[PDB]
Protein backbone atom coordinates (compact mmCIF):
# COMPACT_ATOMS: atom_id res chain seq x y z
CA UNK A 1 0.00 0.00 0.00
CA UNK A 2 1.77 3.10 -1.35
CA UNK A 3 1.91 6.67 0.00
CA UNK A 4 0.47 9.17 -2.48
CA UNK A 5 -0.33 12.87 -3.00
CA UNK A 6 -2.39 14.41 -5.80
CA UNK A 7 -2.50 18.20 -5.91
CA UNK A 8 -4.47 20.71 -7.96
CA UNK A 9 -4.37 24.51 -8.29
CA UNK A 10 -5.79 27.03 -5.86
CA UNK A 11 -4.45 30.02 -7.83
CA UNK A 12 -1.69 31.04 -10.20
CA UNK A 13 0.98 33.51 -8.98
CA UNK A 14 3.20 35.45 -11.39
CA UNK A 15 10.63 35.30 -15.86
CA UNK A 16 8.40 33.04 -13.66
CA UNK A 17 4.90 31.72 -12.90
CA UNK A 18 4.08 29.17 -10.22
CA UNK A 19 0.98 27.45 -8.88
CA UNK A 20 -0.35 27.47 -5.34
CA UNK A 21 -1.26 23.79 -4.71
CA UNK A 22 -3.97 22.13 -2.58
CA UNK A 23 -4.24 18.37 -1.87
CA UNK A 24 -7.25 16.46 -3.12
CA UNK A 25 -5.89 12.94 -2.39
CA UNK A 26 -3.45 11.97 0.32
CA UNK A 27 -2.28 8.71 1.76
CA UNK A 28 0.62 8.46 4.19
CA UNK A 29 2.47 11.44 5.55
CA UNK A 30 5.90 11.80 3.95
CA UNK A 31 4.92 14.70 1.66
CA UNK A 32 3.38 18.14 2.28
CA UNK A 33 2.14 20.89 -0.04
CA UNK A 34 3.06 24.31 1.38
CA UNK A 35 1.60 26.84 -1.04
CA UNK A 36 3.68 26.85 -4.23
CA UNK A 37 6.15 24.10 -3.16
CA UNK A 38 6.01 20.56 -1.82
CA UNK A 39 8.17 19.51 1.12
CA UNK A 40 9.56 15.98 1.31
CA UNK A 41 9.82 14.57 4.80
CA UNK A 42 10.62 10.96 3.92
CA UNK A 43 13.62 9.85 1.94
CA UNK A 44 12.61 7.51 -0.86
CA UNK A 45 12.02 6.78 -4.53
CA UNK A 46 8.95 8.48 -6.00
CA UNK A 47 7.05 8.64 -9.19
CA UNK A 48 6.47 12.36 -9.76
CA UNK A 49 4.05 13.52 -12.44
CA UNK A 50 3.11 17.02 -13.59
CA UNK A 51 0.61 18.35 -16.07
CA UNK A 52 0.02 21.94 -16.96
CA UNK A 53 -2.74 23.15 -19.26
CA UNK A 54 -1.61 26.20 -21.29
CA UNK A 55 -3.74 28.80 -23.14
CA UNK A 56 -0.95 31.12 -24.39
CA UNK A 57 -0.75 32.22 -28.00
CA UNK A 58 2.50 31.85 -30.04
CA UNK A 59 5.41 30.99 -27.80
CA UNK A 60 6.88 27.73 -26.57
CA UNK A 61 5.43 26.86 -23.16
CA UNK A 62 6.45 24.31 -20.58
CA UNK A 63 6.95 23.56 -16.94
CA UNK A 64 10.10 22.66 -15.06
CA UNK A 65 10.07 20.37 -12.01
CA UNK A 66 13.07 20.64 -9.65
CA UNK A 67 14.35 19.55 -6.26
CA UNK A 68 16.32 21.73 -3.87
CA UNK A 69 17.88 19.98 -0.87
CA UNK A 70 20.87 20.06 1.41
CA UNK A 71 22.81 22.76 -0.47
CA UNK A 72 22.09 22.00 -4.16
CA UNK A 73 19.43 22.64 -6.80
CA UNK A 74 18.61 20.07 -9.50
CA UNK A 75 16.14 19.94 -12.38
CA UNK A 76 14.29 16.62 -12.36
CA UNK A 77 12.36 16.90 -15.60
CA UNK A 78 10.67 19.37 -17.93
CA UNK A 79 7.78 19.35 -20.41
CA UNK A 80 7.94 21.56 -23.55
CA UNK A 81 5.18 22.48 -26.09
CA UNK A 82 5.06 24.84 -29.04
CA UNK A 83 1.80 26.80 -29.15
CA UNK A 84 -0.17 27.77 -32.28
CA UNK A 85 -0.06 31.41 -33.39
CA UNK A 86 -3.91 31.45 -33.57
CA UNK A 87 -4.34 28.05 -28.67
CA UNK A 88 -4.59 25.09 -26.30
CA UNK A 89 -2.23 22.37 -25.12
CA UNK A 90 -1.64 20.21 -22.05
CA UNK A 91 1.96 19.33 -21.27
CA UNK A 92 2.42 16.14 -19.25
CA UNK A 93 5.70 14.64 -17.98
CA UNK A 94 6.69 12.28 -15.21
CA UNK A 95 9.56 10.19 -13.91
CA UNK A 96 11.05 8.30 -11.02
CA UNK A 97 13.44 10.06 -8.66
CA UNK A 98 15.22 9.57 -5.37
CA UNK A 99 14.09 12.36 -3.05
CA UNK A 100 15.75 13.09 0.29
CA UNK A 101 13.92 14.30 3.42
CA UNK A 102 14.18 18.09 3.70
CA UNK A 103 13.91 18.38 -0.12
CA UNK A 104 11.71 21.14 -1.62
CA UNK A 105 9.93 20.31 -4.93
CA UNK A 106 9.16 23.25 -7.26
CA UNK A 107 7.03 23.48 -10.42
CA UNK A 108 7.91 26.62 -12.39
CA UNK A 109 6.78 28.03 -15.72
CA UNK A 110 9.50 30.38 -17.04
CA UNK A 111 7.22 33.14 -18.37
CA UNK A 112 5.61 36.13 -16.71
CA UNK A 113 1.89 35.90 -15.94
CA UNK A 114 1.67 32.63 -17.83
CA UNK A 115 -1.87 31.85 -18.96
CA UNK A 116 -2.26 28.55 -17.05
CA UNK A 117 -5.61 26.83 -16.35
CA UNK A 118 -6.70 26.53 -12.71
CA UNK A 119 -8.80 23.53 -13.69
CA UNK A 120 -7.95 20.50 -11.52
CA UNK A 121 -8.59 18.27 -14.58
CA UNK A 122 -5.98 20.14 -16.65
CA UNK A 123 -3.21 21.27 -14.28
CA UNK A 124 -2.07 18.91 -11.54
CA UNK A 125 0.91 17.54 -9.68
CA UNK A 126 1.38 14.23 -7.97
CA UNK A 127 3.59 11.75 -6.15
CA UNK A 128 3.67 8.01 -5.46
CA UNK A 129 6.23 6.52 -3.13
CA UNK A 130 7.66 3.39 -4.71
CA UNK B 1 2.26 -7.40 -6.46
CA UNK B 2 -0.19 -4.89 -7.96
CA UNK B 3 -3.48 -5.43 -9.81
CA UNK B 4 -3.36 -4.02 -13.34
CA UNK B 5 -5.37 -3.62 -16.57
CA UNK B 6 -4.09 -2.45 -19.95
CA UNK B 7 -6.71 -1.96 -22.66
CA UNK B 8 -6.55 -1.21 -26.36
CA UNK B 9 -9.17 -0.41 -29.02
CA UNK B 10 -11.46 -2.87 -30.74
CA UNK B 11 -13.32 -0.14 -32.66
CA UNK B 12 -14.26 3.52 -32.50
CA UNK B 13 -17.95 4.46 -32.06
CA UNK B 14 -19.27 7.94 -32.87
CA UNK B 15 -20.65 15.90 -29.75
CA UNK B 16 -19.00 12.55 -28.79
CA UNK B 17 -16.69 9.69 -29.82
CA UNK B 18 -15.75 6.76 -27.60
CA UNK B 19 -13.64 3.63 -27.88
CA UNK B 20 -14.73 0.04 -27.42
CA UNK B 21 -11.93 -1.47 -25.24
CA UNK B 22 -10.44 -4.99 -25.03
CA UNK B 23 -7.95 -6.17 -22.37
CA UNK B 24 -4.47 -7.23 -23.42
CA UNK B 25 -2.97 -7.43 -19.89
CA UNK B 26 -4.80 -8.24 -16.70
CA UNK B 27 -3.74 -9.08 -13.19
CA UNK B 28 -6.17 -9.30 -10.30
CA UNK B 29 -9.89 -8.89 -10.67
CA UNK B 30 -11.07 -5.52 -9.35
CA UNK B 31 -11.55 -3.94 -12.79
CA UNK B 32 -13.57 -4.92 -15.88
CA UNK B 33 -13.81 -3.49 -19.39
CA UNK B 34 -17.41 -3.63 -20.63
CA UNK B 35 -17.33 -2.28 -24.17
CA UNK B 36 -16.81 1.49 -24.05
CA UNK B 37 -16.58 1.79 -20.22
CA UNK B 38 -14.61 0.20 -17.39
CA UNK B 39 -16.36 -0.96 -14.23
CA UNK B 40 -14.60 -0.72 -10.87
CA UNK B 41 -15.42 -3.50 -8.46
CA UNK B 42 -12.78 -2.77 -5.81
CA UNK B 43 -12.50 0.45 -3.89
CA UNK B 44 -8.95 1.77 -3.96
CA UNK B 45 -6.35 4.23 -5.20
CA UNK B 46 -5.33 3.75 -8.83
CA UNK B 47 -2.95 5.16 -11.32
CA UNK B 48 -5.07 5.73 -14.43
CA UNK B 49 -3.40 6.55 -17.74
CA UNK B 50 -4.89 7.33 -21.15
CA UNK B 51 -3.39 7.96 -24.55
CA UNK B 52 -5.26 8.76 -27.71
CA UNK B 53 -3.64 9.07 -31.12
CA UNK B 54 -5.41 11.73 -33.24
CA UNK B 55 -5.32 12.24 -37.05
CA UNK B 56 -7.75 15.19 -37.34
CA UNK B 57 -6.89 18.30 -39.30
CA UNK B 58 -7.23 21.82 -37.74
CA UNK B 59 -9.14 21.68 -34.50
CA UNK B 60 -8.13 21.19 -30.90
CA UNK B 61 -8.45 17.51 -29.95
CA UNK B 62 -8.37 15.77 -26.61
CA UNK B 63 -9.85 13.10 -24.44
CA UNK B 64 -11.68 13.38 -21.15
CA UNK B 65 -11.52 10.66 -18.47
CA UNK B 66 -14.34 10.63 -15.90
CA UNK B 67 -15.84 8.58 -13.10
CA UNK B 68 -19.55 8.14 -12.46
CA UNK B 69 -20.53 6.49 -9.18
CA UNK B 70 -23.17 6.49 -6.50
CA UNK B 71 -25.16 9.47 -7.81
CA UNK B 72 -22.46 11.86 -9.12
CA UNK B 73 -20.31 12.44 -12.20
CA UNK B 74 -16.74 13.77 -11.96
CA UNK B 75 -14.02 14.54 -14.49
CA UNK B 76 -10.73 13.00 -13.39
CA UNK B 77 -8.40 14.45 -15.99
CA UNK B 78 -8.20 15.58 -19.60
CA UNK B 79 -5.55 15.82 -22.32
CA UNK B 80 -5.69 18.67 -24.89
CA UNK B 81 -3.74 19.13 -28.19
CA UNK B 82 -3.94 21.69 -30.97
CA UNK B 83 -3.69 20.07 -34.41
CA UNK B 84 -1.88 21.48 -37.47
CA UNK B 85 -4.01 22.88 -40.30
CA UNK B 86 -2.05 20.71 -42.82
CA UNK B 87 -1.78 16.16 -38.95
CA UNK B 88 -0.69 13.77 -36.21
CA UNK B 89 -0.48 13.91 -32.43
CA UNK B 90 -0.71 11.57 -29.45
CA UNK B 91 -2.24 13.00 -26.29
CA UNK B 92 -1.16 11.28 -23.07
CA UNK B 93 -2.32 12.05 -19.51
CA UNK B 94 -2.46 10.16 -16.26
CA UNK B 95 -3.01 10.59 -12.55
CA UNK B 96 -3.79 8.97 -9.24
CA UNK B 97 -7.39 8.75 -8.07
CA UNK B 98 -9.53 7.15 -5.39
CA UNK B 99 -12.10 5.00 -7.16
CA UNK B 100 -15.08 3.43 -5.38
CA UNK B 101 -16.57 0.01 -6.20
CA UNK B 102 -19.57 0.43 -8.52
CA UNK B 103 -17.78 3.32 -10.31
CA UNK B 104 -17.94 3.53 -14.12
CA UNK B 105 -14.85 4.98 -15.90
CA UNK B 106 -15.45 6.72 -19.26
CA UNK B 107 -13.02 7.97 -21.92
CA UNK B 108 -14.76 10.45 -24.24
CA UNK B 109 -13.58 12.58 -27.15
CA UNK B 110 -15.98 15.55 -27.53
CA UNK B 111 -16.19 15.58 -31.35
CA UNK B 112 -18.35 13.68 -33.79
CA UNK B 113 -16.73 10.81 -35.68
CA UNK B 114 -13.34 11.77 -34.29
CA UNK B 115 -10.48 10.44 -36.40
CA UNK B 116 -8.84 8.28 -33.69
CA UNK B 117 -6.30 5.50 -34.37
CA UNK B 118 -7.32 1.94 -33.50
CA UNK B 119 -3.64 1.08 -33.14
CA UNK B 120 -2.94 -0.50 -29.73
CA UNK B 121 0.48 1.25 -29.74
CA UNK B 122 -1.14 4.69 -30.14
CA UNK B 123 -4.48 4.62 -28.29
CA UNK B 124 -4.69 2.84 -24.95
CA UNK B 125 -6.09 2.98 -21.45
CA UNK B 126 -4.77 1.50 -18.26
CA UNK B 127 -4.96 1.07 -14.50
CA UNK B 128 -2.65 0.11 -11.64
CA UNK B 129 -3.98 -0.38 -8.15
CA UNK B 130 -1.66 1.34 -5.69
CA UNK C 1 9.62 -1.86 -2.36
CA UNK C 2 9.76 -1.83 -6.18
CA UNK C 3 12.67 -2.41 -8.57
CA UNK C 4 13.33 0.64 -10.76
CA UNK C 5 15.61 2.03 -13.49
CA UNK C 6 15.78 5.62 -14.74
CA UNK C 7 18.05 6.24 -17.72
CA UNK C 8 19.23 9.37 -19.50
CA UNK C 9 21.25 10.00 -22.68
CA UNK C 10 24.99 9.68 -23.08
CA UNK C 11 24.88 10.42 -26.82
CA UNK C 12 22.64 10.19 -29.85
CA UNK C 13 23.56 7.74 -32.66
CA UNK C 14 22.11 8.03 -36.17
CA UNK C 15 15.54 5.73 -41.32
CA UNK C 16 16.68 5.54 -37.64
CA UNK C 17 18.09 7.38 -34.61
CA UNK C 18 18.65 5.82 -31.20
CA UNK C 19 20.00 6.92 -27.83
CA UNK C 20 22.90 5.46 -25.89
CA UNK C 21 21.53 5.22 -22.30
CA UNK C 22 23.22 5.51 -18.88
CA UNK C 23 21.55 4.75 -15.52
CA UNK C 24 21.11 7.53 -12.99
CA UNK C 25 18.78 5.62 -10.60
CA UNK C 26 18.71 1.89 -10.03
CA UNK C 27 17.08 -0.34 -7.49
CA UNK C 28 17.03 -4.12 -7.80
CA UNK C 29 18.75 -6.01 -10.56
CA UNK C 30 16.26 -7.33 -13.11
CA UNK C 31 17.04 -4.71 -15.77
CA UNK C 32 20.26 -3.59 -17.51
CA UNK C 33 21.06 -0.78 -19.94
CA UNK C 34 23.55 -1.97 -22.57
CA UNK C 35 24.26 1.05 -24.75
CA UNK C 36 21.23 1.73 -26.95
CA UNK C 37 19.04 -1.13 -25.59
CA UNK C 38 17.82 -2.38 -22.22
CA UNK C 39 17.98 -6.07 -21.36
CA UNK C 40 15.30 -7.64 -19.18
CA UNK C 41 16.53 -10.40 -16.91
CA UNK C 42 13.41 -10.81 -14.76
CA UNK C 43 10.01 -11.76 -16.08
CA UNK C 44 7.35 -9.41 -14.77
CA UNK C 45 4.90 -6.57 -15.27
CA UNK C 46 6.51 -3.15 -15.65
CA UNK C 47 5.53 0.42 -16.03
CA UNK C 48 7.68 1.69 -18.90
CA UNK C 49 7.89 5.41 -19.63
CA UNK C 50 9.72 7.31 -22.36
CA UNK C 51 10.20 10.97 -23.11
CA UNK C 52 12.08 12.44 -26.00
CA UNK C 53 12.72 16.15 -26.45
CA UNK C 54 12.71 17.10 -30.17
CA UNK C 55 14.16 20.23 -31.86
CA UNK C 56 13.38 19.37 -35.52
CA UNK C 57 11.67 21.83 -37.83
CA UNK C 58 8.55 20.83 -39.87
CA UNK C 59 8.01 17.10 -39.78
CA UNK C 60 6.11 14.80 -37.47
CA UNK C 61 8.45 13.40 -34.81
CA UNK C 62 8.04 10.59 -32.34
CA UNK C 63 9.63 7.65 -30.64
CA UNK C 64 8.73 3.99 -30.77
CA UNK C 65 9.29 1.63 -27.83
CA UNK C 66 9.46 -2.10 -28.63
CA UNK C 67 10.30 -5.47 -27.14
CA UNK C 68 12.14 -8.25 -28.94
CA UNK C 69 12.22 -11.64 -27.21
CA UNK C 70 12.22 -15.34 -27.89
CA UNK C 71 11.69 -15.12 -31.66
CA UNK C 72 9.28 -12.17 -32.08
CA UNK C 73 9.30 -8.37 -32.26
CA UNK C 74 6.47 -6.26 -30.83
CA UNK C 75 5.80 -2.53 -30.58
CA UNK C 76 4.74 -1.62 -27.05
CA UNK C 77 3.82 2.01 -27.53
CA UNK C 78 4.67 5.13 -29.52
CA UNK C 79 4.52 8.90 -29.01
CA UNK C 80 3.79 11.20 -32.00
CA UNK C 81 4.10 15.03 -32.31
CA UNK C 82 3.72 17.43 -35.21
CA UNK C 83 6.43 20.10 -35.21
CA UNK C 84 6.02 23.78 -36.17
CA UNK C 85 7.44 24.91 -39.51
CA UNK C 86 9.26 27.81 -37.73
CA UNK C 87 10.52 24.35 -33.02
CA UNK C 88 10.36 22.53 -29.68
CA UNK C 89 8.32 19.69 -28.25
CA UNK C 90 8.66 16.90 -25.70
CA UNK C 91 6.84 13.67 -26.47
CA UNK C 92 5.98 11.55 -23.42
CA UNK C 93 4.26 8.14 -23.36
CA UNK C 94 4.10 5.24 -20.96
CA UNK C 95 2.25 2.04 -20.23
CA UNK C 96 2.19 -1.25 -18.39
CA UNK C 97 3.56 -4.36 -20.08
CA UNK C 98 4.46 -7.96 -19.34
CA UNK C 99 8.14 -8.37 -20.14
CA UNK C 100 9.87 -11.76 -20.29
CA UNK C 101 13.47 -12.43 -19.19
CA UNK C 102 15.78 -12.34 -22.22
CA UNK C 103 13.69 -9.49 -23.73
CA UNK C 104 15.48 -6.55 -25.39
CA UNK C 105 13.78 -3.11 -25.09
CA UNK C 106 14.46 -0.60 -27.90
CA UNK C 107 13.66 3.12 -28.21
CA UNK C 108 13.87 4.23 -31.85
CA UNK C 109 13.17 7.50 -33.64
CA UNK C 110 12.40 6.73 -37.32
CA UNK C 111 14.35 9.62 -38.88
CA UNK C 112 17.98 10.02 -39.85
CA UNK C 113 20.17 12.14 -37.57
CA UNK C 114 17.12 13.18 -35.57
CA UNK C 115 17.69 16.40 -33.64
CA UNK C 116 17.11 14.98 -30.14
CA UNK C 117 18.18 16.69 -26.89
CA UNK C 118 20.83 14.94 -24.77
CA UNK C 119 19.45 16.76 -21.74
CA UNK C 120 18.58 14.29 -18.96
CA UNK C 121 15.64 16.56 -18.01
CA UNK C 122 14.16 16.33 -21.52
CA UNK C 123 14.96 12.86 -22.90
CA UNK C 124 14.71 9.87 -20.57
CA UNK C 125 13.59 6.28 -20.26
CA UNK C 126 12.45 4.37 -17.23
CA UNK C 127 11.02 1.22 -15.67
CA UNK C 128 9.17 0.23 -12.50
CA UNK C 129 8.48 -3.40 -11.72
CA UNK C 130 4.90 -3.73 -10.52
UniProtKB/Swiss-Prot annotation, chains A, B, C:
One GO CC term on file: external side of plasma membrane
Bridged cysteine pairs (disulfide): 79-91
Keywords: Cleavage on pair of basic residues, Cytokine, Disulfide bond, Glycoprotein, Immunity, Secreted
Single Gene Ontology MF annotation: tumor necrosis factor receptor binding
Post-translational modification: The soluble form derives from the membrane form by proteolytic processing.
Chain positions carrying an annotated carbohydrate: 11
Misc note: Transgenic mice develop lymphoid tumors that originate from expansion of the peritoneal B-1 B-cell population. Aging transgenic mice develop progressive hyperplasia in mesenteric lymph nodes and Peyer patches, disorganization of affected lymphoid tissues, mucosal and capsular infiltration, and eventual tumor cell infiltration into non-lymphoid tissues such as kidney and liver.
Recorded family membership: Belongs to the tumor necrosis factor family.
Designated name of the protein: Tumor necrosis factor ligand superfamily member 13
The encoding gene: Tnfsf13
Amino acid sequence: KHSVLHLVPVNITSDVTEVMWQPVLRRGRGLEAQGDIVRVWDTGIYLLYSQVLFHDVTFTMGQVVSREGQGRRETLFRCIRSMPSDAYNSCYSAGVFHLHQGDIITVKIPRANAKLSLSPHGTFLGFVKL
